């Protein structure tokens, strides 16, 4: 059970974003059902009154947490993968129109996941903005934790995977717009029971195994890490 408390771009904290340049659910409880419109942005997917201003190049961080800001962030036990997708906002994340911008399972060397790493790094993972259409946009951030996924929540609805799923509102000013978006996938849609990375054994079988629900990164993405990039006792 985790949630977005906001954004840092450049390294800068933008303040508070929970329904305001969030499109915050009034929980941290998980979405398990695949085929829900729960899948796109979670509970409450509405517009919200802001939109944080980016330009193509900077780097945008967002900052989870458990119950308050910089606390446990996520119970260790929720092992899994993060991503983050981006749409255009007239969508409204329907149809074939998120592209994946970031992608981390399970590092070899560390032996971490990027679960484990993002609790180290205090909530905080981030993108670079890509070379799109100046305009505005959501930012999926999307963590899976495993520790149910040996079972499927359509045979089972009280186990499977766990989606942790956070739409922010940006806006992109300054783009050249050399890398413009292509077609995406759907959400919901794009997980299926059989596709790989949605069932998974992390008691029994190696890490080094696990395969991350496709698609795969986009070429056009500038990259981007798990982190901290801000420090919010700062403030
Ligand atoms: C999952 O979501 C779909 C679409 O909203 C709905 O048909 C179905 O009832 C849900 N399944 C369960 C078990 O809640
Ligand atoms: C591995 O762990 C060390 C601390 O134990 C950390 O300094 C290092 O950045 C980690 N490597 C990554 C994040 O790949
Ligand atoms: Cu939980």
Same mark, same amino acid.
């Given at each position: ?52 201003? +980016?330009?193509? *190049? #900077?780097? $945008? ?10 606390? !446990?962030?996520?119970? %260790? ?54 070379? +799109?259409?100046? *305009? #505005?946009? $959501? ?10 996924? !040996?079972?499927?929540? %359509? ?81």
């Amino acid at each position: 059970h985790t949630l977005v408390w906001g954004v840092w771009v450049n390294g800068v904290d933008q303040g508070d974003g929970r329904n305001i340049y969030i499109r915050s659910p009034p929980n941290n409880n998980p979405v398990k059902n695949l085929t829900s419109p729960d899948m796109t942005c979670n509970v409450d997917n509405r517009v919200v009154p802001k939109s944080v201003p +980016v330009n193509a *190049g #900077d780097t $945008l961080t967002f900052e989870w947490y458990h119950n308050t800001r910089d606390d !446990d962030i996520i119970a %260790s036990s929720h092992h899994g993968p993060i991503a983050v997708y981006i749409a255009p906002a007239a969508s409204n994340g329907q149809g074939n129109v998120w592209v994946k911008l970031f992608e981390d399972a399970y590092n070899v060397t560390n032996s971490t996941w990027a679960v484990d790493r993002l609790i180290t790094a205090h909530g905080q993972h981030s993108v670079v903005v890509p070379h +799109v259409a100046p *305009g #505005d946009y $959501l930012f999926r951030a999307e963590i899976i934790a495993l520790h149910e996924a !040996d079972s499927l929540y %359509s045979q089972n609805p009280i186990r499977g995977a766990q989606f942790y799923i956070s739409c922010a509102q940006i806006t992109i000013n300054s783009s050249d717009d050399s890398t413009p978006l292509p077609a995406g996938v759907p959400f919901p849609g794009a997980y299926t029971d059989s596709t790989p990375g949605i069932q998974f054994n992390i008691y029994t079988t190696p890490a080094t195994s696990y395969v991350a629900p496709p698609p795969s990164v986009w070429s056009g993405a500038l990259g981007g890490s798990i982190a901290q990039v801000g420090d919010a006792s700062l403030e």
